[PDB]
Design an enzyme around this catalytic site. Structure first.
Site, PDB file in Angstrom:
ATOM      1  N   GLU A   1      -1.502  -6.593 -10.285  1.00  0.00           N
ATOM      2  CA  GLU A   1      -0.393  -5.853  -9.534  1.00  0.00           C
ATOM      3  C   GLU A   1       0.897  -6.084  -9.594  1.00  0.00           C
ATOM      4  O   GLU A   1       1.715  -5.212  -9.690  1.00  0.00           O
ATOM      5  CB  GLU A   1      -0.893  -6.013  -7.958  1.00  0.00           C
ATOM      6  CG  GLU A   1      -2.070  -5.582  -7.340  1.00  0.00           C
ATOM      7  CD  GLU A   1      -2.051  -3.804  -7.251  1.00  0.00           C
ATOM      8  OE1 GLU A   1      -3.132  -3.445  -7.110  1.00  0.00           O
ATOM      9  OE2 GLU A   1      -1.020  -3.160  -7.581  1.00  0.00           O
TER      10      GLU A   1
ATOM     11  N   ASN B   1       6.939   5.059  -4.572  1.00  0.00           N
ATOM     12  CA  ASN B   1       6.025   6.029  -4.954  1.00  0.00           C
ATOM     13  C   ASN B   1       6.615   7.424  -4.539  1.00  0.00           C
ATOM     14  O   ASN B   1       7.417   7.353  -3.691  1.00  0.00           O
ATOM     15  CB  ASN B   1       4.611   5.850  -4.162  1.00  0.00           C
ATOM     16  CG  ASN B   1       3.963   4.524  -4.728  1.00  0.00           C
ATOM     17  OD1 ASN B   1       3.626   4.333  -5.807  1.00  0.00           O
ATOM     18  ND2 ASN B   1       3.790   3.607  -3.662  1.00  0.00           N
TER      19      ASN B   1
ATOM     20  N   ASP C   1       5.268   9.644  -2.683  1.00  0.00           N
ATOM     21  CA  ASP C   1       4.911   9.871  -1.373  1.00  0.00           C
ATOM     22  C   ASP C   1       5.977   9.653  -0.211  1.00  0.00           C
ATOM     23  O   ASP C   1       5.598   9.607   1.043  1.00  0.00           O
ATOM     24  CB  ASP C   1       3.621   9.775  -1.082  1.00  0.00           C
ATOM     25  CG  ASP C   1       3.192   8.466  -0.793  1.00  0.00           C
ATOM     26  OD1 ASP C   1       3.964   7.535  -1.250  1.00  0.00           O
ATOM     27  OD2 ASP C   1       2.055   7.848  -0.468  1.00  0.00           O
TER      28      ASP C   1
ATOM     29  N   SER D   1       6.116   6.090   0.287  1.00  0.00           N
ATOM     30  CA  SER D   1       5.868   4.820   0.500  1.00  0.00           C
ATOM     31  C   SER D   1       6.308   4.137  -0.745  1.00  0.00           C
ATOM     32  O   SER D   1       6.571   4.407  -1.812  1.00  0.00           O
ATOM     33  CB  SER D   1       4.406   4.730   0.606  1.00  0.00           C
ATOM     34  OG  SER D   1       3.741   4.981  -0.469  1.00  0.00           O
TER      35      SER D   1
ATOM     36  N   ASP E   1       5.217   0.179  -2.490  1.00  0.00           N
ATOM     37  CA  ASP E   1       4.223  -1.191  -2.523  1.00  0.00           C
ATOM     38  C   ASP E   1       5.191  -2.391  -2.746  1.00  0.00           C
ATOM     39  O   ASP E   1       6.079  -2.520  -3.584  1.00  0.00           O
ATOM     40  CB  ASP E   1       3.525  -1.093  -3.625  1.00  0.00           C
ATOM     41  CG  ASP E   1       2.571   0.473  -3.728  1.00  0.00           C
ATOM     42  OD1 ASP E   1       2.370   0.983  -4.910  1.00  0.00           O
ATOM     43  OD2 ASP E   1       2.135   0.595  -2.920  1.00  0.00           O
TER      44      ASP E   1
ATOM     45  N   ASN F   1       0.871  -1.489   0.415  1.00  0.00           N
ATOM     46  CA  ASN F   1       1.528  -0.173   0.744  1.00  0.00           C
ATOM     47  C   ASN F   1       1.991   0.005   2.190  1.00  0.00           C
ATOM     48  O   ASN F   1       1.200  -0.356   3.155  1.00  0.00           O
ATOM     49  CB  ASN F   1       0.655   0.953   0.351  1.00  0.00           C
ATOM     50  CG  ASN F   1       1.317   2.240   0.206  1.00  0.00           C
ATOM     51  OD1 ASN F   1       1.242   3.210   1.278  1.00  0.00           O
ATOM     52  ND2 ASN F   1       1.971   2.785  -0.755  1.00  0.00           N
TER      53      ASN F   1
END
Length: 129
Positions: A35, A46, A48, A50, A52, A59
């Site tokens: 990760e 991201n 959308d 969001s 991370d 998220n």
């Protein structure tokens, strides 16, 4: 902070992740490796809306509040800033909540792409835990 591999494993074990919900310790260390490369400040934004956050790339849609993500549930009840701390406390406490939902460690993209079904005990090789 960039953690060492065994340094991280030790911290994760102190917080009871070894075997939690059916996931041996090496799964969690492997997840963090792929990760974030063990980097507490890793951030990925991201499409959308969001983001991370942190060593486990948690998220922001469901798990933490960053003030700008649509569909926000903040189910760990924490600011996303907590997930960027140099100690792993907030990330491991939230991870316990995530993994207890629905699809277990399938929530972690990198775990599904690089760790699932592999020899995950390799990630605690040469650690004295």
């Amino acid at each position: 902070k960039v953690f060492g591999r065994c340094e991280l494993a030790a911290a994760m074990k102190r917080h009871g992740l070894d075997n939690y919900r059916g996931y041996s310790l090496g799964n969690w260390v492997c997840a963090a490796k792929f990760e974030s490369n063990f980097n507490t400040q890793a951030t990925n934004r991201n499409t959308d809306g969001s983001t991370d956050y942190g060593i486990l790339q948690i998220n922001s849609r469901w798990w933490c509040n960053d003030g700008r993500t649509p569909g926000s549930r903040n189910l760990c009840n924490i600011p996303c800033s907590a997930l960027l701390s140099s100690d792993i406390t907030a990330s491991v406490n939230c991870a316990k909540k995530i993994v207890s939902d629905g699809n277990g460690m399938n929530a972690w993209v990198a775990w599904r792409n690089r760790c699932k079904g592999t020899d995950v005990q390799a990630w605690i090789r040469g650690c004295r835990l």
